[PDB]
Amino acid sequence: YNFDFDVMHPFMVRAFTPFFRPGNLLELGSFKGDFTSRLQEHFNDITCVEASEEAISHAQGRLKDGITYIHSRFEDAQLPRRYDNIVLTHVLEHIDDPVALLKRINDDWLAEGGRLFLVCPNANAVSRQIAVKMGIISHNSAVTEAEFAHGHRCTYALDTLERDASRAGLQVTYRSGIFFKALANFQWDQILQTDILSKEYLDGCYQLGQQYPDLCASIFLLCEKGINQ
Template sequence: MSHERDGAIDATRNYDAELRDNAGRKYAYNFDLDVMHPFMVRSFIPFFQTGNCLELGSYLGDFTKRLLKHFDQVTCVEASGDAVAHLESTLGDAVRCVHATFEDVQLDRHFENIVLTHVLEHLDDPVLVLRRINEEWLTDNGRLLLVCPNANAPSRQIAVKMGLIPHNAAVTDAERQHGHRITYSLDTLERDARAAGLKVIHRSGIFFKALANFQWDRLLAIDIISQDYLEGCYQLGQLYPDLCASIFLVCEKAG
């Protein structure tokens, strides 16, 4: 595995601490890893381009492993030193790790595929990073596959009605401890993509979701949710993207 240290790590943020579970929220739920990740890859496959892949934000490499089934090598840029150490110890030479922030990293190549899943909402300046993707890292025929948690997911709307959060796009204290800066909806996500000069060629949602992640984890643990039910939630999400767990854009360089 190639590990490079490139770009200044922001001393005002503790990226290692942001990855740790806190009293109000896990960083990654079984629902994320076992349900959402496979459906994300399934949504991506029709848009993959032949060539290489850049993953911005790899956490502990669970999604990276899924990408490696489709690409010979994945370049991973990750700000957390703890996460980089884990990637180095588990994923081998198929992954090229760069320990840096997206704002500061300098990459020596361009990419046909750039993957940004549940990361943009953590950034202090998301448009700046999207602009770097557009202007510096995408090939002329490359594609950005961009996924964010959805402010309008029914689970969040129910939480508003229950008085747990003040509005759909609120950032909770537990989310803030994990580094969240914004909760996107389809309109605000596309706004930022366009502001960075990207062209949106596809917009959709991934997985209709009326329950919170911790509730899904409890259901999955007692084995009462069938694969057919999960498939139904995925397909329903194609009809109602604004009611999905995550929102999904495919972007290219503007002509």
């Protein structure tokens, strides 16, 4: 029915699974708990940070126990411990000072041996590149008016995402992509109401995407803590 929640969310969890560390999980920007519900299958100790009281309240009404909720902007958040897994998915592109957020993650929140799961929408996704060729988007890394209205301040590609992670002091351990994406979201949502594409086709786009990270819907950096003093 819905591309981001019914297709992308499940494949994002699948992409993270082989890298998850045992222990606890911090979900930054957990919004209404839609992704949290999927992570609860893997983690019994999840902390969620979200600035919207309303989103957080919605989450709290639909998730199982074992979640610690923190209603705060990231700059103001005082967390009680450090975390073995941290999830920052489709959040960084909303942040005015992304390097500062990533640096907090590296310096304050990641446990020793902990891993950051950094995922952003990808400037070089096939569907976007086609939109650029059609002249609907000026260029790949452009921020469209709709994206700006949604809160985006940039459109990452693997090059600029790893730059920001490196500038923050993180160690980028793995680079990958999630879901080979040749149609726009609005076309997916139409086509998914039909029997034209199978579940197996969607799995094939996930499998093939790993071979063409630069062309995927979302790009994925697995990062570990770097030493900063």
